[PDB]
Amino acid sequence: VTGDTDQPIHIESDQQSLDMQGNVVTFTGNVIVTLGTIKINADKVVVTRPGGEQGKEVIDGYGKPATFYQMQDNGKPVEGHASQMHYELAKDFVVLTGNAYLQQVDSNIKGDKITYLVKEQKMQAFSDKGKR
């Protein structure tokens, strides 16, 4: 269920704490993040919001090991890795950076950074300006 919105983000983690200001947290211990049947295996994850000021907030994650699963629009499963992942609610996509890899039999992308557009073929090199 949604509005005319982004899908709900799901996180499974082993142990964490909650914020005394209710707005800045972390999720930790062999973590799974799930959205749109994308999977991300992680170790430490972040969610952070300004109480709803300007309606903008962000999601970040790191893994030891990290793995990024998706389906591809051509009806296939896919796997990969990256050193960090990031999302924000006006972007259509999730972005992965530092030491990144994703591959099908049809296509290979690896280097700095990965993004995948869940409607259009613009998976490309976009070599980076900060490991974050």
């Binding site: 919105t5 982004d6 983000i9 499974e12 983690s13 082993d14 969610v47 609610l89």
Partner: peptide
């Protein structure tokens, strides 16, 4: 965003 977080370590959940 609508968020849900769940413990692997207990099998129980909360929305954000």
């Amino acid at each position: 965003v609508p968020i849900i977080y769940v413990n692997r370590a207990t099998x129980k959940c909360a929305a954000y």
